[PDB]
Tab-separated table of C-alpha atoms and ligand atoms in Angstrom:
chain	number	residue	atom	x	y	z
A	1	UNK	CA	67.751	12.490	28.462
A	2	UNK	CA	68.311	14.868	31.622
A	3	UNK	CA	70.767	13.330	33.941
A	4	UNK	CA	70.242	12.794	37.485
A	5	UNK	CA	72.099	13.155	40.545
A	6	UNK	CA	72.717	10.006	43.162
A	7	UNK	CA	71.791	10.556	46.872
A	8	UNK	CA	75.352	10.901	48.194
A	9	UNK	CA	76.111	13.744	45.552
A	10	UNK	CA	72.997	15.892	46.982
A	11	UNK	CA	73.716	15.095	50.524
A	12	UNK	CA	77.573	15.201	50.388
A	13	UNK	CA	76.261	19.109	49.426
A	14	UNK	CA	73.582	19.369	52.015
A	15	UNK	CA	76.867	19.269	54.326
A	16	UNK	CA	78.822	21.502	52.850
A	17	UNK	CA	79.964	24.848	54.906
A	18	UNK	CA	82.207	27.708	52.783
A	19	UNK	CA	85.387	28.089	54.994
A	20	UNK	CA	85.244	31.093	56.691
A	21	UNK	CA	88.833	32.812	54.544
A	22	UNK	CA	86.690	32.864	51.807
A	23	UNK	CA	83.851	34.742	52.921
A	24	UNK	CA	85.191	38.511	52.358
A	25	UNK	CA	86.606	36.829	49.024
A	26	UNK	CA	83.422	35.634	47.241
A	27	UNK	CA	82.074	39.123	47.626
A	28	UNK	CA	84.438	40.589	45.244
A	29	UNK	CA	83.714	40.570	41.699
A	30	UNK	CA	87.262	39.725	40.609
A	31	UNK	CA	87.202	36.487	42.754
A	32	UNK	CA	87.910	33.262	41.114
A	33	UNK	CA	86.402	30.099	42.158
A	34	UNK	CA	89.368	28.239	39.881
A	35	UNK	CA	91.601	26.788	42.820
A	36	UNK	CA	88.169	25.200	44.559
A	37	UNK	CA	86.553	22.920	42.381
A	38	UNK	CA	85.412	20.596	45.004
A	39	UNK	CA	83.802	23.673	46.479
A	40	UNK	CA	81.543	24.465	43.347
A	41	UNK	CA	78.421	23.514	43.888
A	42	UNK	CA	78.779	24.413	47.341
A	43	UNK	CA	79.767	28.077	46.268
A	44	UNK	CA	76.530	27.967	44.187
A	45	UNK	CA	74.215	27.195	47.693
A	46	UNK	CA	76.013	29.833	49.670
A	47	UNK	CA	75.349	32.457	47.333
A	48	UNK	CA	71.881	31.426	46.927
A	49	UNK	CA	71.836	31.586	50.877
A	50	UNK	CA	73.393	35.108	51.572
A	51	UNK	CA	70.810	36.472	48.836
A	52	UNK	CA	67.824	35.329	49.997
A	53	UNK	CA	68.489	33.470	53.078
A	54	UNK	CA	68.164	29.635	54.842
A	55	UNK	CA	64.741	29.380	53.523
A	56	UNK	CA	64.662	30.830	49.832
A	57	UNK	CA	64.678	26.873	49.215
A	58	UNK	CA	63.569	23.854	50.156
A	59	UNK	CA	67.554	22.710	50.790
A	60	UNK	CA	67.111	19.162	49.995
A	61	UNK	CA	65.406	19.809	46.449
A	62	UNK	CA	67.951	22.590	45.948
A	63	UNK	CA	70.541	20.449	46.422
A	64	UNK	CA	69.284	17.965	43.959
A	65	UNK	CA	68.620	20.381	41.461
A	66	UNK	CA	72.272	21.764	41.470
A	67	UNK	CA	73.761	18.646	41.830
A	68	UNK	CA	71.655	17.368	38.528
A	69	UNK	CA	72.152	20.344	36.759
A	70	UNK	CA	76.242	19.779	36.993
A	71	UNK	CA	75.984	16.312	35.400
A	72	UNK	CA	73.513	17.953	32.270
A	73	UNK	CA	77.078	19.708	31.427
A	74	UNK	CA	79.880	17.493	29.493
A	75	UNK	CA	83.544	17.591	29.980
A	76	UNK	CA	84.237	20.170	27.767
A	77	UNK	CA	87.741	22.562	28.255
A	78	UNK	CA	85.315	25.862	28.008
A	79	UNK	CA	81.734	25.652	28.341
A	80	UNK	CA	81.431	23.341	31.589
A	81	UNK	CA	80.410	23.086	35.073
A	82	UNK	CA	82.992	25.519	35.782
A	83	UNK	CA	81.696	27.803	33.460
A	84	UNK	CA	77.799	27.801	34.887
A	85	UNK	CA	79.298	28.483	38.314
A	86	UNK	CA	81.688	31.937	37.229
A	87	UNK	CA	78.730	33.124	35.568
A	88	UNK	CA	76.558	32.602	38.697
A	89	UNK	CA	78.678	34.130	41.015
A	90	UNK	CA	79.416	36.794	38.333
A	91	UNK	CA	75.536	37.499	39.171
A	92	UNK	CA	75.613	36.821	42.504
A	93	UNK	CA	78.519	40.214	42.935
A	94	UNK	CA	75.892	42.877	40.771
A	95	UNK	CA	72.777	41.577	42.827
A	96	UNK	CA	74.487	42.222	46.387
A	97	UNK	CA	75.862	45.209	45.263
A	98	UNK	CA	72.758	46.399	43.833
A	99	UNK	CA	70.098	44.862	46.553
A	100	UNK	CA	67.553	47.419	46.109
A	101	UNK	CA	67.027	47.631	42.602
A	102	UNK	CA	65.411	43.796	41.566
A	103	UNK	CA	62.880	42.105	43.036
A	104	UNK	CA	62.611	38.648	44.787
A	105	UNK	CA	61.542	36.722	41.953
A	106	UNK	CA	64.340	38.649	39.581
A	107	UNK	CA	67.376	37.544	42.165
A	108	UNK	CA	65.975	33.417	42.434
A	109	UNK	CA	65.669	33.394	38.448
A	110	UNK	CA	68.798	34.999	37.747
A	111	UNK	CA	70.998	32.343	40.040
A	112	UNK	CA	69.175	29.864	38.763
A	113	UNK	CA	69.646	30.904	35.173
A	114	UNK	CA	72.878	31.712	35.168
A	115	UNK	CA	74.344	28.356	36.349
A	116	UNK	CA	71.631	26.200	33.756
A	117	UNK	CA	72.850	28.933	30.476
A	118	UNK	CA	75.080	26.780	28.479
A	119	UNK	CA	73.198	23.326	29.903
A	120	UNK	CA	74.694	20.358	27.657
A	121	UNK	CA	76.909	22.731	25.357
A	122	UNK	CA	78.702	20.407	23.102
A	123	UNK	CA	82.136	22.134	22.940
A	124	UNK	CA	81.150	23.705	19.218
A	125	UNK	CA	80.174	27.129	17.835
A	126	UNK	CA	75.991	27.861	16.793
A	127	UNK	CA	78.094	27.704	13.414
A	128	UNK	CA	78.815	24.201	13.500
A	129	UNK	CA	65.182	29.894	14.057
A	130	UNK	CA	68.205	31.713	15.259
A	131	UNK	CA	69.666	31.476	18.767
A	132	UNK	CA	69.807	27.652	18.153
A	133	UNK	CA	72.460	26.708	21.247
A	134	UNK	CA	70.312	28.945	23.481
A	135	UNK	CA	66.737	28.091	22.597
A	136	UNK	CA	67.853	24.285	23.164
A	137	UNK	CA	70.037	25.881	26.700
A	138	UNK	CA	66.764	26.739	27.980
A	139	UNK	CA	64.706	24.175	27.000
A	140	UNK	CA	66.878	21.631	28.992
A	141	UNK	CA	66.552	23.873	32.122
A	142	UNK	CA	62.362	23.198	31.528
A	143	UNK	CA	63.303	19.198	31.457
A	144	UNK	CA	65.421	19.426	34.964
A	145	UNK	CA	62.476	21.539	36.533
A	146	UNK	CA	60.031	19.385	35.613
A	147	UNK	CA	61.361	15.551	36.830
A	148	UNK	CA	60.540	14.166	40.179
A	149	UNK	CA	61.929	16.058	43.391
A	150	UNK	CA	63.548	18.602	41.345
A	151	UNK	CA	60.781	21.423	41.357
A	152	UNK	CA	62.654	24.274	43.051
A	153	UNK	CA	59.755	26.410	42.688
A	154	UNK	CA	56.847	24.288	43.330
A	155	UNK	CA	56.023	26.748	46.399
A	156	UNK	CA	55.050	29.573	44.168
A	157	UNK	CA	51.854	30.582	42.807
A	158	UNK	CA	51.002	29.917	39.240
A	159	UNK	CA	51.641	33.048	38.913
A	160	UNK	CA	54.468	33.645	40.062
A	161	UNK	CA	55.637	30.656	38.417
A	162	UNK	CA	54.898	31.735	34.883
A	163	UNK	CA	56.386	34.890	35.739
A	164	UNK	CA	60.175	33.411	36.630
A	165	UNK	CA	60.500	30.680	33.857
A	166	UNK	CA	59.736	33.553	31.450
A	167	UNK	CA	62.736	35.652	33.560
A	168	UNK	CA	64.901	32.339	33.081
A	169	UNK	CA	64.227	32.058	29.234
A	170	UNK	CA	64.302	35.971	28.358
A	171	UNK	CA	68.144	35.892	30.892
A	172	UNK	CA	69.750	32.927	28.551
A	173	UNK	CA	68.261	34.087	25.065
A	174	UNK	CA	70.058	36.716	26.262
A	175	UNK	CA	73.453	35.148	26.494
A	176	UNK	CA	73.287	34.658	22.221
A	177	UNK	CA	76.580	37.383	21.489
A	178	UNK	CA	74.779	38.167	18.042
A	179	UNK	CA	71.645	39.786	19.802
A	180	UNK	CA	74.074	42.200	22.662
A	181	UNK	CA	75.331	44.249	19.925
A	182	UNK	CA	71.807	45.457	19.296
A	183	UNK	CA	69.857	45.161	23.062
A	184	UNK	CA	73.461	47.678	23.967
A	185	UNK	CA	72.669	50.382	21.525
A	186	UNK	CA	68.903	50.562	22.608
A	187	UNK	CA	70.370	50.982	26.026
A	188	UNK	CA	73.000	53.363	24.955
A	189	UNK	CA	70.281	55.167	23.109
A	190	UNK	CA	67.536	54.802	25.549
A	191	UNK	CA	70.228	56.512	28.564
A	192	UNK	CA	71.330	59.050	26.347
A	193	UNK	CA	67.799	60.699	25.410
A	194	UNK	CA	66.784	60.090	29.187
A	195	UNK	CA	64.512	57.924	28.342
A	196	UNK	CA	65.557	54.608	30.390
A	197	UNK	CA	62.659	53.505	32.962
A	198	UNK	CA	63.277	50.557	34.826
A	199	UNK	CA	59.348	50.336	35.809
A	200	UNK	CA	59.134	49.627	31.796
A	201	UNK	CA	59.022	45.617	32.104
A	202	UNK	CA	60.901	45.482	28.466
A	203	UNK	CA	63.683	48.302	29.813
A	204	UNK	CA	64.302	45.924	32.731
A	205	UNK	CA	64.489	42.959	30.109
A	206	UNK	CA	67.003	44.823	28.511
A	207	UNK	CA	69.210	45.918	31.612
A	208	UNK	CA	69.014	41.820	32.575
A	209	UNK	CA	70.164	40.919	28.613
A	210	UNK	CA	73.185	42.930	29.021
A	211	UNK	CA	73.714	41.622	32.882
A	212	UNK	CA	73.507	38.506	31.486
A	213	UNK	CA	76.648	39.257	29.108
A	214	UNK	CA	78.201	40.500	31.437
A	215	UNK	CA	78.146	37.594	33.346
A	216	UNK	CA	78.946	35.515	30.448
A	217	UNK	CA	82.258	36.912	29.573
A	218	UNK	CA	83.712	37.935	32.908
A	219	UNK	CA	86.475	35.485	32.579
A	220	UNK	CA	87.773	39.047	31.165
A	221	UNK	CA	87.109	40.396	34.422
A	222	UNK	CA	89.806	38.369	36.595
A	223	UNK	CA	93.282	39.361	37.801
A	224	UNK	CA	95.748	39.077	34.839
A	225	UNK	CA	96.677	34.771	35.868
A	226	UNK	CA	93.731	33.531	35.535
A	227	UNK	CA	92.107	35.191	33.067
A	228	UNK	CA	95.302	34.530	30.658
A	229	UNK	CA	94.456	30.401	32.305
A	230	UNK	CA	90.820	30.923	31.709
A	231	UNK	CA	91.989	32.152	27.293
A	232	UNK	CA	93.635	28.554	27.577
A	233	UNK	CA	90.505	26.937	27.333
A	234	UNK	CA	88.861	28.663	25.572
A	235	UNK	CA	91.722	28.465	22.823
A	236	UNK	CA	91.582	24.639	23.625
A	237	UNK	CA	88.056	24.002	21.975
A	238	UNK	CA	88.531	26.531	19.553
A	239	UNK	CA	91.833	24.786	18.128
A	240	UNK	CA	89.938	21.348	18.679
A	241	UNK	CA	87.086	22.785	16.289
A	242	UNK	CA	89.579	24.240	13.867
A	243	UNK	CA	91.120	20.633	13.777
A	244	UNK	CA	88.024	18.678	12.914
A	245	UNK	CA	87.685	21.072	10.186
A	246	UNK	CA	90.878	20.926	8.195
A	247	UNK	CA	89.950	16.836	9.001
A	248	UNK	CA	87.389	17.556	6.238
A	249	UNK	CA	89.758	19.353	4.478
A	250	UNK	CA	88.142	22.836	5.068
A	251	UNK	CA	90.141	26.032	5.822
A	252	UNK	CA	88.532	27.308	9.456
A	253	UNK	CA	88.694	31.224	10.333
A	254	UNK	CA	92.372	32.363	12.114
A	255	UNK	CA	90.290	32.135	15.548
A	256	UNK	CA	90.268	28.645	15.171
A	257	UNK	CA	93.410	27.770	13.462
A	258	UNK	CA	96.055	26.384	16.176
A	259	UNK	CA	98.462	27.708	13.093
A	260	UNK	CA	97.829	31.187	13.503
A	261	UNK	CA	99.100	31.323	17.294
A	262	UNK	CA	100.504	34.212	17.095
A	263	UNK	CA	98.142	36.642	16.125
A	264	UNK	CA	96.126	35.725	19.663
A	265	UNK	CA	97.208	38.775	21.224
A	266	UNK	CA	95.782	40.377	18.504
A	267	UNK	CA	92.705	39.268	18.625
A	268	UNK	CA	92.306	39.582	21.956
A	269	UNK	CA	92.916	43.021	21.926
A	270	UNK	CA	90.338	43.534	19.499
A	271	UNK	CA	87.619	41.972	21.064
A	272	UNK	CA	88.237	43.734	24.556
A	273	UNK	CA	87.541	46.967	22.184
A	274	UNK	CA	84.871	45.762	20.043
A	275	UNK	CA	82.838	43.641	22.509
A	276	UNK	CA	84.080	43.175	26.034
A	277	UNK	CA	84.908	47.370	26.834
A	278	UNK	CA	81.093	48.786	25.906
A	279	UNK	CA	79.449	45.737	27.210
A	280	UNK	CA	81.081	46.458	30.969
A	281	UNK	CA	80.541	51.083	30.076
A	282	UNK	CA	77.158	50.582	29.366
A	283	UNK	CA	76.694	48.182	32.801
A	284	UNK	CA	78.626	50.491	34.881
A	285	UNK	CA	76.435	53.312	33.224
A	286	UNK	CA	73.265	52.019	34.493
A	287	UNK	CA	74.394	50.496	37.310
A	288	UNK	CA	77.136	52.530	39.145
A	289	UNK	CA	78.372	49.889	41.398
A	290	UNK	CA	79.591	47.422	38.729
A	291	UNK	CA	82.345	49.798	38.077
A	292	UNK	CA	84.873	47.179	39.189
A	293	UNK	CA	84.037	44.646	36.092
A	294	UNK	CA	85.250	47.788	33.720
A	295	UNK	CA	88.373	48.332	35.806
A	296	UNK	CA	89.337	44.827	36.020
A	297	UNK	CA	88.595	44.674	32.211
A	298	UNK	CA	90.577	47.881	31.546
A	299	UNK	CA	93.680	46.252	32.922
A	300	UNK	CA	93.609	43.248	31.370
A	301	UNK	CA	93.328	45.325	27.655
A	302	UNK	CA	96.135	46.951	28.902
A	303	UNK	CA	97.734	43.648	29.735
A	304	UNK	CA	97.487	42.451	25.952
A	305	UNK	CA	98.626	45.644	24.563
A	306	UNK	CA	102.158	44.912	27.002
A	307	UNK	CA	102.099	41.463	25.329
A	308	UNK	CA	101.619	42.650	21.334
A	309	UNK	CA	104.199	45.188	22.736
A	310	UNK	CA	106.598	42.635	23.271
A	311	UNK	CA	107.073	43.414	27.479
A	312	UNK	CA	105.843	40.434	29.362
B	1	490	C1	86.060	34.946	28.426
B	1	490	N1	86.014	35.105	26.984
B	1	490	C2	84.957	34.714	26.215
B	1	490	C3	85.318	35.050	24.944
B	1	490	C4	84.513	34.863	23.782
B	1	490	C5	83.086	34.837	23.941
B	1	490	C6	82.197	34.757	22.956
B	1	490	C7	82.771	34.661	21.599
B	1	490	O1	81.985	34.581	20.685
B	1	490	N2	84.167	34.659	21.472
B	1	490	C8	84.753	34.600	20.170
B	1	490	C9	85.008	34.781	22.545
B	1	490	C10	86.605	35.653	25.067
B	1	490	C11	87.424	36.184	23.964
B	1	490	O2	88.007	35.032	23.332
B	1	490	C12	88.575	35.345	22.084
B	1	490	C13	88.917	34.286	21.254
B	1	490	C14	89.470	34.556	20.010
B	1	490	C15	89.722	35.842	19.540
B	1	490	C16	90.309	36.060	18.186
B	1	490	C17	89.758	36.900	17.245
B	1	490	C18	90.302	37.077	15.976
B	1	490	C19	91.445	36.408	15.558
B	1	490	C20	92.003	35.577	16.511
B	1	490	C21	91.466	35.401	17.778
B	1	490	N3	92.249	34.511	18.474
B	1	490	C22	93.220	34.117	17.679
B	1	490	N4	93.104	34.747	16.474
B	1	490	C23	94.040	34.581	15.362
B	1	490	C24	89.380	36.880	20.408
B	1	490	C25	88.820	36.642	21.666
B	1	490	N5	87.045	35.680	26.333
B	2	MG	MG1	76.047	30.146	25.597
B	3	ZN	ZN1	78.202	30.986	28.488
């Protein structure tokens, strides 16, 4: 177990060059990688280069590495390859427009953890000790750092080493849903009494939890096409789920159920209130130049409403 990558997939990247019309694009947190798929991995390298340069990496075990991780995730109509990469770059937008604020070691983990987070994701909810998806997410990313010529960070100290796989693990525990509600309202809290203090190593793992969801949902983040695309498929391996239960003769939640199509909009609407709206206030509370993520979220809320409406 742990795929590997053939020497024409990590040299075919090696070549790679981002056309120069996308360049002002990629910096913009509404951008969508969707129409470029044979660009992904080679998205993932130049964002790795503009944050920290032509020699943040040894490129030829860099190349490996990414080009391993993408076959570690399965052919799934949600949480894929495609997936890792919108997360990434969601992370790659907050750490250029907030350069000052995280440290070296912070901006290499981050990248790095946001494109292994849902590494060999079956396609099925943690419903079917806790954080059981996520504990197994990370220990995967361990297995893909450790074979052969795939140590990306073999050039740091032991220190420094132990100090960036525990940044990697504490960023995708992070991405577990049931644990934001709680890490938001100690940051609500801890801004509100004035409290907040970033050279607190347990505030900053905080901040980076709810960057990290942030990231993770941002499909809610897109211009109105593609994130309405992107709710395809998720609905996709939802419905598939909700099938192979009623296979078993069991009733699955109306999420699930392919039957209950209508009440999507719904739903949606909901969750932008409930989950997707204080996740991007809070960001944008601590971190002024997100503000963009909330806007673009704001009008796709307002986009559902128009559709429940019945004016679209
Ligand atoms: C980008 N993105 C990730 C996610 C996401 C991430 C983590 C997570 O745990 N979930 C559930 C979703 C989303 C929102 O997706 C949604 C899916 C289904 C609903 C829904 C709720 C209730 C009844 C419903 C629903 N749909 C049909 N009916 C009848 C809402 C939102 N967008
Ligand atoms: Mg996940
Ligand atoms: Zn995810």
């Amino acid at each position: 177990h742990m795929s590997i990558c053939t020497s024409e997939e990590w040299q075919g990247l090696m070549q790679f060059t981002l056309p120069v019309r996308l360049c002002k694009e990629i910096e913009l947190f509404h951008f969508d990688i969707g129409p470029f798929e044979n660009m992904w991995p080679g998205i993932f390298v130049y964002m790795v280069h503009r944050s920290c340069g032509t020699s943040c990496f040894e490129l030829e075990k860099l190349c490996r590495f990414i080009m391993s991780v993408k076959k570690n995730y399965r052919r799934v109509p949600y949480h894929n390859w495609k997936h890792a990469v919108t997360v990434a770059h969601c992370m790659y937008a907050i750490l250029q427009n907030n350069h000052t604020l995280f440290t070296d070691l912070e901006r290499k983990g981050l990248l790095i953890a946001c494109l292994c987070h849902d590494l060999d994701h079956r396609g099925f909810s943690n419903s079917y000790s806790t954080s059981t998806m996520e504990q197994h997410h990370f220990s995967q990313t361990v297995s893909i750092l450790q074979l052969e010529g795939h140590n990306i960070f073999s050039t740091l100290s032991s220190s420094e080493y132990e100090q960036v796989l525990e940044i990697i693990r504490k960023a995708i525990i992070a991405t577990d849903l049931a644990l934001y509600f709680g890490n938001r309202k100690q940051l609500e809290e801890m801004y509100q009494t004035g409290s907040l203090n970033l050279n607190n190593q347990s505030h900053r793992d905080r901040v980076i939890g709810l960057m990290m969801t942030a990231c993770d949902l941002c499909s809610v983040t897109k211009l109105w096409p593609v994130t309405k695309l992107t709710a395809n498929d998720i609905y996709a391996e939802f419905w598939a789920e909700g099938d192979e239960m009623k296979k078993l003769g069991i009733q699955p939640i109306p999420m699930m159920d392919r039957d209950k199509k209508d009440e999507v909009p719904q739903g949606q609407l909901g969750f932008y209130n409930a989950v997707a709206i204080p996740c991007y206030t809070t960001l944008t509370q601590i971190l002024p130049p997100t503000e963009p993520l909330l806007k673009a979220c704001r009008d796709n809320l307002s986009q559902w409403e128009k559709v429940i409406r019945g004016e679209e």
